[PDB]
Design a protein around this ligand. Structure first.
Ligand SMILES: CCCCCCCCCCCCCCCCCC(=O)OC[C@H](COP(=O)([O-])OCC(O)COP(=O)([O-])OC[C@@H](COC(=O)CCCCCCCCCCCCCCCCC)OC(=O)CCCCCCCCCCCCCCCCC)OC(=O)CCCCCCCCCCCCCCCCC
Ligand code: BCL
Ligand code: BCL
Ligand code: BCL
Ligand SMILES: CC[C@H]1c2cc3[nH]c4c(c3C)C(=O)[C@H](C(=O)OC)c4c3nc(cc4[nH]c(cc(n2)[C@@H]1C)c(C(C)=O)c4C)[C@@H](C)[C@@H]3CCC(=O)OC/C=C(\C)CCC[C@H](C)CCC[C@H](C)CCCC(C)C
Ligand SMILES: CC[C@H]1c2cc3[nH]c4c(c3C)C(=O)[C@H](C(=O)OC)c4c3nc(cc4[nH]c(cc(n2)[C@@H]1C)c(C(C)=O)c4C)[C@@H](C)[C@@H]3CCC(=O)OC/C=C(\C)CCC[C@H](C)CCC[C@H](C)CCCC(C)C
Ligand SMILES: COC1=C(OC)C(=O)C(C/C=C(\C)CC/C=C(\C)CC/C=C(\C)CC/C=C(\C)CC/C=C(\C)CC/C=C(\C)CC/C=C(\C)CC/C=C(\C)CC/C=C(\C)CCC=C(C)C)=C(C)C1=O
Ligand SMILES: COC(C)(C)C(=O)C/C=C(\C)CC/C=C(\C)CC/C=C(\C)CCCC/C(C)=C/CC[C@H](C)CC/C=C(\C)CCC=C(C)C
Ligand SMILES: CCCCCCCCCCCC[N+](C)(C)[O-]
Ligand SMILES: CCCCCCCCCCCC[N+](C)(C)[O-]
Ligand SMILES: CCCCCCCCCCCC[N+](C)(C)[O-]
Ligand SMILES: CCCCCCCCCCCC[N+](C)(C)[O-]
Ligand SMILES: CCCCCCCCCCCC[N+](C)(C)[O-]
Ligand SMILES: [Fe+3]
Lengths: 250, 281, 302
């Protein structure tokens, strides 16, 4: 019966497609390793795919995936248990060491570029013609940590030029040096900017940028990993929800 | 085993309940307190689905069906064989889904990421509770909930739809469908745009988000952007399921006639739109 | 509280972006349009520019003529009375030839001749629009994934209105151009073919339609969960894996035991959505042509 033929054929078709799709999604991370770095024995019923290469614009190289996988950074962790499957405890300060939810990835130490070979992200003072066009302008506002103290003041916005959107706040510290705060990790209020992820005292430890008009991909992973990591590691110093609600009327 | 970059993320912390008493993995899976809870609920519910399957006779998985208690049983409990097993399974299933959401919450907390994923899952759970809890309780009987069979739950849809005529005229059903279609439309476009930039004509360089905007600006005159597309996708998916749960929380509660009869409002509105010559007057 | 990245807090605006050039013939791009502050709360604020080629204009022309052919006939049914044409807008219907004409193009204008005219206009609107989504991507050096996906929707639309009616023998098999009438058509079709719920391709199609909602919900929320790590710059995370992409994979790995890549999630995405109309078209095509009662059919087979 032809309908039987058709539905039968589609299920043989569907099985092959799931095979193709699952091996396609194995171009990163694989082959699986053991908790010590060495190849793992049982790799699953799927073989790695035939490699593929991306040509990156602005003569930045190529990328072939899957290729050999190396973290290429210090991982300040230590194995807690004997058998596999248990946590790996930090050996030091995990915020400063950038492990766990403070993690970062050893990306290229160059900025991302738009379709013209220019830095994708710049401060507004150095991005020609960019201004705040709706919403509360946060420049000048004081910047408050989750312990409810003031950590600095907004001195500029860093903008994604081709996409016309805000990506970082530039926050001056007491020492007069600045830092970048991820736009998705800040609440912009009528009279302050509130940062739930960081107690006022961890702002100084935000990793810094080497050039005050560009930010490199590696710098972005360090800054964002750190801020995100304060959620778990700064919890001792995070005042309560009612404590914050009350702070309004102070 | 681990992905080649996994180890640096497998630190302690993030739990909601139990400290580190369950802070470990099994293979790729994280367990935590709610992996235990999920296992308890689903295994119990599966055990009872088997028990209800032997009371029925068959082992064919297309024939097993756990029915809700009859209508005359109102909102009270029923014996296991006559609806009671359905009622415990509904509790376990609910316990499994809720624990599953909270396990994701633990996983988010370890990884330092937003809580958007469990939040979006709650929309699916709430849609399920609309069909088996909120609507039946509002109608007076568990027997209004759907049964648990691969084909009987389908026959429930058909019987329930045709009870109020053509369900298409349900205006909230109309909206829900519009969201399901626009979601599929947007999903296809969003996978295609990223793939077409990551994989240009053979021998060319990877494209940039600038090309993605230009493609859509050229094609339709607007591009929502790389962040807006992900927000839109979530909102479309969640709006579809929201207007789905709404279209039934009103069906047999705030309205009980043929659903075609709703669209005679503007036609036969008290302004007596006599306006003859057409089919409506 | 905590920012969720659902709505932009602060909008920024620069000099108007005319876009990437590549091999686009810039003689055909409009100027930049205005900015919308409302749109910039959710997505981009800039409107335009748009490209207007030969194909785009031909498409908008036939698209209007199709629309205007239903519009002329709807005014007609309303007794040419404006107040009536508004109250019955959803009940008007431009309907295909009666079954006895078969595939003849001899239908009188008021008995499905105007339906054959509107269809020709839509046939040319859609197919020239498809050509425009190949050409726009070609002009930019991009892949043709969009136009290949748009082929899946065209498949189901061609099955309902062109391919099945011919195999069956009449234009009456096709769909009416009416807001409520095409819902009525959908219902009768299921009844006449023995409960479309028992068409195993209608079953697959629904699974994929639910799955598209499922999949975009996971992926949109996943990307939003990691926008704090630049996660929505997916192209650069494909070329240079960031902690965004790694935490996303690991959320799913720790949750369901497997996981994707920042590029292959989009392969799942394209195929989830495209199998909806691919299975759906097959299901409809086999109805009345190969199977007359899906329920009775399925009791015999399997
Ligand atoms: C009847 C139904 C008819 C339906 C009508 C229309 C159908 C439209 C299909 C929708 C396709 C959308 C997906 C697009 C896509 O991924 O392709 C990208 C790709 C675009 O590439 P590009 O833009 O040039 O970019 C260059 C890159 O460098 C390189 O490009 P890339 O890497 O980005 O893309 C590569 C891509 C190429 O994409 C394709 O191959 C698309 C193929 C479309 C096929 C349509 C399905 C046919 C239904 C048959 C079912 C039977 C039931 C009857 O790879 C695949 O997707 C591979 C296909 C999966 C293979 C699975 C094998 C299954 C066999 C199982 C056997 C084992 C089981 C044992 C048990 O598009 C195509 O390959 C074009 C395909 C055109 C198909 C038209 C169908 C004719 C009608
Ligand atoms: C003859 C039948 C009637 C009709 C009567 C009905 C009836 C009756 C109903 C709908 C409902 C729906 N209809 Mg209608 N409808 C008809 C024709 C259509 C057509 C069409 C093209 O003709 C379409 C597109 C739709 C569209 C839809 C949707 C709006 C909606 C279904 C999705 C939903 O809400 O999911 C919501 C999602 C869920 C409920 C999923 C929940 C998942 C849970 C949280 C988790 C499960 C986990 C699982 C157990 C894990 C398993 C193990 C793992 C896999 C390992 N209908 C005809 C005219 N319609 C339904 C609705 O609105 O429901 C609220 C509904 O009940
Ligand atoms: C949502 C609105 C309606 C409804 C209307 C329809 C219609 C109409 C159809 C289905 C179909 C299906 N429905 Mg139903 N269905 C509803 C409620 C549910 C619930 C639930 C707990 O709320 C579940 C789990 C299911 C499950 C399913 C699958 C058997 C099937 C494919 C759907 C799919 O891929 O979705 C998206 C989900 C995924 C892609 C993820 C994978 C989930 C897998 C497939 C679930 C397997 C469930 C298993 C067999 C039973 C529970 C197993 C436990 C381990 C004990 N339905 C309500 C009442 N459903 C289709 C079908 O073919 O039915 C025979 C079909 O045509
Ligand atoms: C009583 C009614 C019947 C029924 C009868 C049918 C029939 C009949 C059909 C479906 C179809 C579908 N049904 Mg069913 N179905 C019922 C019950 C359901 C239920 C449910 C919960 O009860 C659900 C969820 C579904 C689900 C579905 C979908 C999976 C599927 C349509 C996919 C789609 O996106 O099409 C939407 C997408 C398109 C139509 C493609 C459009 C492409 C063209 C090119 C667009 C052109 C645009 C034009 C130019 C306009 C321009 C406008 C301007 C630019 C602004 N059915 C019951 C049993 N169902 C279809 C299918 O595939 O069946 C196998 C179908 O034909
Ligand atoms: C809100 C929009 C969409 C959505 C969202 C959504 N669903 C999600 C997620 C999100 C964001 C998850 O994070 C979560 C997940 O982890 O997915 C991989 C999930 C998920 N969505 C699922 C299913 C699902 N979602 C659906 C739909 C959608 N989900 C919406 C369209 C549908 C349908 C029919 O449309 C289904 C079938 C699972 C794949 C998964 C959650 C897995 C889970 O909760 O596991 C714990 C429980 C078990 C392993 C088994 C419990 C078994 C019971 C005790 C017995 C069975 C009871 C059941 C009532 C029987 C039903 C019989 C059927 C024939 C009716
Ligand atoms: C894979 C399955 C999904 C899919 C895919 C899909 N559709 C697609 C694409 C893809 C991948 C495209 O490339 C293409 C596109 O360009 O999208 C942006 C398209 C698209 N899918 C569309 C529609 C569509 N897709 C649908 C469905 C689906 N599309 C599936 C869910 C549906 C339904 C029924 O669910 C519809 C209606 C179009 C928006 C577009 C194709 C456009 C086209 O061919 O247009 C020709 C017609 C014209 C150019 C103009 C006609 C005139 C107007 C009708 C006039 C009326 C205007 C009124 C007077 C104005 C009122 C204004 C108010 C503000 C007052
Ligand atoms: C950009 O980023 C993104 C990624 O990454 C880069 C991703 O990966 C993903 C993830 C997406 C995919 C992998 C695509 C394919 C996924 C789908 C088609 C969605 C539907 C998924 C399924 C059908 C699988 C559902 C499977 C489940 C529910 C797991 C089954 C559960 C078990 C067998 C055991 C569960 C464990 C328990 C109960 C507790 C732990 C164990 C104990 C014994 C205790 C997304 C969304 C993404 O956006
Ligand atoms: C003020 O009013 C004016 C006059 C300005 C207007 O213009 C108002 C306009 C309107 C009110 C228009 C209203 C329009 C609608 C409600 C249309 C709604 C449409 C649908 C619901 C679409 C139904 C689905 C249609 C399908 C599935 C069509 C497939 C058809 C294919 C085109 C088939 C292929 C081609 C064929 C058969 C043509 C063959 C002829 C040849 C010469 C080859
Ligand atoms: C219905 C969609 C099916 C989803 C399952 C697809 C493959 C799951 C198994 C992935 C294997 C994980 N592994 C071993 C490669 O790491
Ligand atoms: C998806 C919505 C589509 C909206 C279409 C927007 C097109 C705007 C075209 C901009 C025209 C600007 N200008 C100066 C030429 O008029
Ligand atoms: C789907 C497109 C919808 C775009 C409309 C956006 C609605 C406006 C919401 C305003 C939010 C402004 N605010 C104060 C929260 O920042
Ligand atoms: C077909 C839809 C339902 C599929 C059920 C879930 C598939 C199993 C995928 C989980 C993979 C876990 N594993 C083995 C890789 O560790
Ligand atoms: C590309 C994604 C693949 C996901 C596979 C989903 C398969 C759903 C199976 C549902 C069963 C429907 N049927 C035909 C038995 O009625
Ligand atoms: Fe994406």
């Amino acid at each position: 019966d032809l309908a039987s033929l058709a539905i039968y054929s589609f299920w043989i078709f569907l099985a092959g497609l799931i095979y193709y799709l699952q091996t396609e999604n194995m171009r990163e991370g694989y082959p699986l390793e053991n908790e010590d770095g060495t190849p793992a024995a049982n790799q699953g019923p799927f073989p790695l795919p035939k490699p593929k290469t991306f040509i990156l614009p602005h003569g930045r190289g190529t990328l072939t995936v899957p290729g050999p996988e190396s973290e290429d950074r210090p991982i300040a962790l230590a194995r807690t248990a004997v058998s596999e499957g248990f946590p790996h405890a930090p050996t030091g300060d995990p915020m400063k060491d950038g492990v766990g939810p403070a993690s970062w990835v050893a990306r290229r130490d160059l900025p991302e570029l738009d379709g013209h070979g220019h830095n994708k992200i710049k401060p507004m003072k150095a991005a020609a013609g960019f201004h705040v066009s709706a919403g509360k302008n946060p420049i000048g506002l004081p910047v408050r940590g989750c312990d409810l103290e003031i950590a600095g003041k907004v001195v500029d916005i860093w903008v994604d030029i081709p996409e016309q959107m805000a990506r970082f706040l530039e926050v001056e510290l007491k020492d007069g040096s600045t830092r970048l705060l991820p736009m998705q990790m800040v609440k912009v209020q009528s009279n302050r900017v509130h940062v739930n992820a960081l107690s006022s005292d961890l702002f100084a430890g935000i990793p810094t940028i080497k050039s005050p008009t560009e930010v490199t991909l590696l710098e972005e992973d360090k800054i964002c990993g750190y801020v995100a990591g304060g959620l778990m590691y700064a919890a001792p110093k995070r005042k309560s929800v009612v404590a914050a609600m009350l702070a309004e009327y102070a | 085993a681990l992905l080649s970059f996994e180890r640096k993320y497998r630190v302690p912390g993030g739990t909601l309940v139990g400290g580190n008493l369950f802070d470990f993995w099994v293979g790729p899976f994280y367990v935590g307190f709610f992996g235990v809870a999920t296992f308890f609920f689903a295994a119990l519910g599966i055990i009872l689905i088997a028990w209800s399957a032997v009371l029925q006779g068959t082992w064919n998985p297309q024939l097993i069906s756990v029915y809700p208690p009859a209508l005359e049983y109102g909102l009270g409990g029923a014996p296991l064989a006559k609806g009671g097993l359905w009622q415990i399974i509904t509790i376990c299933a609910t316990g499994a889904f809720v624990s599953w959401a909270l396990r994701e919450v633990e996983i988010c907390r370890k990884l330092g990421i937003g809580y958007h994923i469990p939040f979006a899952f709650a929309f699916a759970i709430l849609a399920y509770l609309t069909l088996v809890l909120f609507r039946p309780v509002m109608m007076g009987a568990w027997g209004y909930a759907f049964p648990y069979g691969i084909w009987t739950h389908l026959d429930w849809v058909s019987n329930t739809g045709y009870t109020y005529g053509n369900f298409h005229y349900n205006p909230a059903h109309m909206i829900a469908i519009t969201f399901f279609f626009t979601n599929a439309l947007a999903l296809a476009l969003h996978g295609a745009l990223v793939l077409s930039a990551a994989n240009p004509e053979k021998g060319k360089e990877m494209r940039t988000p600038d090309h993605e905007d230009t493609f859509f600006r050229d094609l339709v005159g607007y591009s929502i952007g790389t962040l807006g597309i992900h927000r839109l996708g979530l909102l479309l998916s969640l709006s579809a399921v929201f207007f789905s749960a709404l279209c039934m929380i009103i069906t047999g509660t705030i309205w009980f006639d043929q659903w075609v009869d709703w669209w005679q409002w503007w036609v036969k509105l008290p302004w007596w739109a006599n306006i003859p010559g057409c089919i409506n007057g | 509280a905590e920012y969720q990245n659902i709505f932009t807090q602060v909008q920024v605006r620069g000099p108007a972006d005319l876009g990437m050039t590549e091999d686009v013939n810039l003689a055909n791009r409009s100027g930049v349009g205005p900015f919308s502050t409302l749109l910039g709360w959710f997505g981009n604020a800039q409107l335009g520019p748009i490209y207007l080629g030969s194909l785009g204009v031909l498409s908008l022309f036939s698209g209007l003529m199709w629309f205007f052919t239903i519009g002329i006939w709807f005014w007609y049914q309303a007794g040419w009375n404006p107040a009536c044409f508004l109250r019955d807008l959803f009940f008007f219907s431009l309907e295909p030839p009666a079954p006895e004409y078969g595939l003849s193009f001899a239908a009188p204008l008021k008995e499905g001749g105007l339906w054959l005219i509107a269809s020709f206009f839509m046939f040319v609107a859609v197919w020239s629009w498809w050509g425009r989504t190949y050409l726009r991507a070609q002009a930019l050096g991009m892949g043709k994934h969009t136009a290949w996906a748009f082929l899946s929707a065209i498949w189901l639309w061609m099955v309902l209105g062109f391919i099945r009616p011919i195999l069956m023998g009449s234009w009456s098999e096709a769909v009416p151009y009416g807001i409520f009438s095409h819902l009525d058509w959908t219902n009768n079709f299921s009844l006449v073919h023995g409960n479309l719920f028992y068409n195993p391709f209608h079953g697959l199609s629904i699974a994929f339609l639910y799955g598209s909602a499922l999949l975009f919900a996971m992926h949109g929320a996943t990307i939003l969960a990691v926008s704090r790590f630049g996660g929505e710059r997916e192209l650069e995370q494909i070329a240079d894996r960031g902690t965004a992409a790694e935490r996303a994979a690991l959320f799913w790995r720790w949750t369901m035991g497997f996981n994707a890549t920042m590029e292959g999630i989009h392969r799942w995405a394209i195929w989830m959505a495209v199998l909806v109309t691919l299975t759906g078209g097959i299901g409809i095509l086999l109805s009345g042509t190969v199977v007359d009662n899906w329920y009775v059919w399925g009791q015999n087979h399997g």
